Every structure is written in C-alpha cells, then in structure tokens.
Design a protein around this ligand. Structure first.
Ligand SMILES: *C(=O)[C@@H]([C@@H]1NC(C(=O)O)=C(SC2CN(C3=NCCS3)C2)[C@@H]1C)[C@@H](C)O
Ligand SMILES: [Zn+2]
Ligand SMILES: [Zn+2]
Ligand SMILES: [Zn+2]
Ligand SMILES: [Zn+2]
Lengths: 384, 16
C-alpha cells in the first residue's frame, strides 16, 4: 500500500532502481530512499486536484510537470495527471512521456543558446530577422502565429515575443549537427533532426528517450539556472539490499554550455515573464526565467477535425526556473483533438506560478550575477 | 516481496 499522489513518482523510482541495480523492487526486498520532497509533492497534488490555486475550465484538462533541484538534478516533485478515477497501479506517467509537442519551449535549447555558445550571435541585442522565410531547401513558409512579420528586431525581443522565423533561421546558422550535439548535452535526442525542430519537439520514435517531456525539459532548463551544467534526473538517493548491502547514488554533472551562454539566455528569458508571452507566471519578488509554448494542429487536423476560427492548441507549455528549482509544465487533453481554449491556455503558466510561489517564499531569492566575459548595456548584455 | 520506500527526509512513504 502507498498514497495516490505518489503513484507517478514511485513508477519512475521502480524504473530507475532496476536501470542501475538490475533488480525490480516489487520482486526483491529492498529499502529505497528517494529524492521526493513529500510536502512539495502534496502541494503539487493540491494545485492539480482542488480549486485553491488554479481556476480550471473543466475536470478532464490534464497537467503533467516535473520539478527539479537545479544543483543536483534531483527530481523533487512529479505528477503526470489530474483527476484519475481509475486506480490501476503505476500507469502511464505523462510527465516522462515525450509524445506531446513541446513547441516553442524548444527554442531556447535548440536555437538561441547554441547560437550564443558557438558564437553565431554576440549579444542579446543582435539584430535578428522576422521576414517572410522558408524552411531551408523547401517552399513551405515559416509562419508566425499572427501570420505577420515584425521585421528587424533584437534577439531578446524575438525570443520574448516568441517569433518563429528568427528561430528557424537561427537553427540554420548554428547548423543541424551542431544543434543536435548541444541538445544531447542537455539530455535530449532525436533519431533525426529537421528544421521544424526549431519550433517543435515533434519526433518519429519517442519509444524511449526521443523528444521532450516535462522531465527532460526540467533537466534541460536547470542547466540555464546553475551556470550551464546538466544533471541526469534522479529519483533515487540510496538503495539498501535484503542482504545488508548499500549502494548510494552520487549525482555528477556535465558542462553543457559556457556560463556566459547560460547567463545571456536567462537574462532574455527574464523578459518573457515581464514584457512577453509569460506574464501569467510573473512574480515581482522572485528572480526567475522561463519560456511559454503553444503547439498547433496539422494541415489534416485543421481541415477535418478542428472547426473554429478561435485561437486553439493541443498543447500549452511552460518551462521556468529560479535560482534553486526548475519546472516544466505540460497542459492539454488526453485526446489531442480536444483543443485548449481561452482560459485553458493560461493554466500551464498559472500552475507554474503557484508551485514556484510555494517553493521560493521564505528563502532569500538570489538573482544571477553577471559573469566574467559579459557586460551590461541599456536593456541588453554584450560579450567581450 | 517486502520493499520500503522513503522520501527525502527518510520517513516511510510506501511499502510494496
Ligand atoms: C510556440 O509554442 C509557438 C508560438 N509561441 C507562442 C507562446 O506561447 O510563446 C505562441 S502563442 C501566441 C503569442 N500570443 C500572444 N497573445 C497576445 C499577444 S502575443 C499568442 C505561438 C503559437 C510556435 C510553435 O508557433
Ligand atoms: Zn499547498
Ligand atoms: Zn492548500
Ligand atoms: Zn535573415
Ligand atoms: Zn530533414
């Protein structure tokens, strides 16, 4: 027996124990010590399943999210579903599932960070281009959400307004192979990468590690938070075996980007919340950064299954981090063909706001310190 | 057969 709110977390623990030990804890007696902050995890459950924190449009709208400790990659909370009146033990955990499109949340990690890392751009003020534009080697246009084009704009403003053209063009300038390598360093892979991946986590396999889940995004963004080191999501701290043996898991990280890249990304993503698309997550007292995401339906889907001229989306996504924690939030419906509408598109950011409030309140929320190699200027940050 | 699971504060949370 075990509490219901822990069902998702335990399922990953079970999977992670046998990955490292080769032993399934359900068939072998062992005491397993985990990274789950029980109080935080309960609060996540409170947010999903009550009225106290978030105004949901209906009871079938789904939320999946993972919260990570930015210093070690310990997953401290995870809930893959809300309102589940079907108690089969250790079911599909949507929080580690990579089969929903993470849309614009791919931009910082696939496009803009690599461009800064490999020195394609030199500052957050670099004039980038929002003009009519085709996917390289194709006649298909990269449309913006409004079908409009802003023209000559700063990098910062591009990311902040979440424009598509500058993102895709940036992926072309970094190069597909170079970008794939960058994503790998952040725990994300594709079997094959394509230019549509500048604005989509859409993939062919997703049998295993391919694409993006709240789990992988939490881990990926955590790198921005800590000056650019990636940690593997860890659910288990220590196992003690029936025969008295004990195995402790130390969490070691890998340099995923230069500290200047991290800082510059953070500095731009601060504005997403203040001046941009992320304004439902804004908190005056909390130094935090983040990126929003709204995936879209296909050509086949708009024609045949989706009937409306209202703004709709199968998936709404937020990915934010403070100095201490990283959180990726996915929202949507089980059936992708049930579209998010009006207030439903604000859930993802409001779930983030509520959880982050809880976790950061009471500490001294530290801001980020401008590192050696960068200097301030007006609204923007420049290299040396 | 008998596996115990503890949170980050070492207090039992599941017995499987
Ligand atoms: C990314 O997910 C898509 C892109 N980005 C995005 C977002 O949520 O950042 C949108 S929603 C769009 C921005 N917005 C505004 N409403 C009032 C003024 S700005 C609705 C957009 C679809 C990318 C895959 O297209
Ligand atoms: Zn609470
Ligand atoms: Zn409460
Ligand atoms: Zn251009
Ligand atoms: Zn291709």
């Amino acid at each position: 027996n075990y509490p219901a709110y822990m069902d998702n977390y335990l399922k990953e623990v079970i999977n992670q124990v046998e990955e490292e030990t080769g032993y399934n804890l359900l068939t072998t007696g062992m005491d397993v010590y985990t990274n789950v902050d029980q109080e935080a995890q309960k609060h996540l459950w409170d947010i999903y399943n009550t009225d106290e924190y978030v105004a949901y449009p209906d009871d079938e709208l789904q939320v999946a999210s993972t919260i990570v400790d930015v210093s070690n990659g310990k997953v401290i909370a995870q809930l893959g579903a809300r309102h589940q009146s079907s108690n089969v033990s250790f079911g599909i955990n949507q929080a580690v599932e990579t089969n929903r499109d993470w849309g614009s949340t791919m931009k910082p990690i696939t496009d803009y960070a690599p461009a800064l890392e490999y020195g394609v751009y030199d500052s957050t003020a670099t004039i980038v281009h929002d003009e009519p534009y085709n996917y390289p080697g194709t006649n298909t246009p990269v449309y913006n959400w409004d079908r409009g084009y802003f023209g000559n704009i700063t990098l910062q403003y591009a990311l902040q307004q979440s424009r598509n053209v500058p993102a895709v063009e940036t992926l072309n300038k970094v190069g597909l192979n170079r970008a794939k390598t960058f994503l790998n360093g952040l725990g994300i892979d594709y079997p094959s990468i394509h230019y549509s991946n500048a604005i989509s986590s859409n993939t062919t396999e997703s049998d295993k590690k391919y694409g993006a889940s709240s789990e992988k995004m939490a881990a990926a963004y955590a790198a921005f938070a800590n000056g650019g080191t990636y940690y593997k999501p860890m659910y288990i701290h220590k196992v003690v075996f029936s025969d008295g043996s004990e195995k402790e898991f130390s969490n070691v990280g890998t340099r995923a980007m230069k500290e200047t890249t991290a800082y510059m990304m953070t500095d731009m993503m601060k504005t997403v919340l203040s001046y941009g698309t992320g304004q439902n997550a804004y908190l005056a007292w909390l130094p935090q950064a983040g990126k929003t995401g709204t995936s879209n339906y296909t050509d086949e889907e708009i024609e045949n299954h989706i009937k409306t001229s209202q703004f709709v989306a199968p998936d709404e996504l937020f990915a934010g981090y403070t100095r201490k924690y990283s959180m990726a939030v996915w929202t949507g419906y089980s059936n992708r063909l049930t579209p998010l509408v009006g207030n439903g598109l604000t859930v993802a950011a409001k779930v983030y706001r509520s959880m982050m409030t809880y976790l950061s309140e009471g500490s001294n929320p530290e801001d980020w310190n401008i590192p050696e190699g960068l200097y301030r200027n007006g609204e923007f940050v420049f290299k040396n | 057969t008998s596996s115990k699971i503890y949170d980050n504060k070492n207090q039992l949370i599941a017995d499987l």
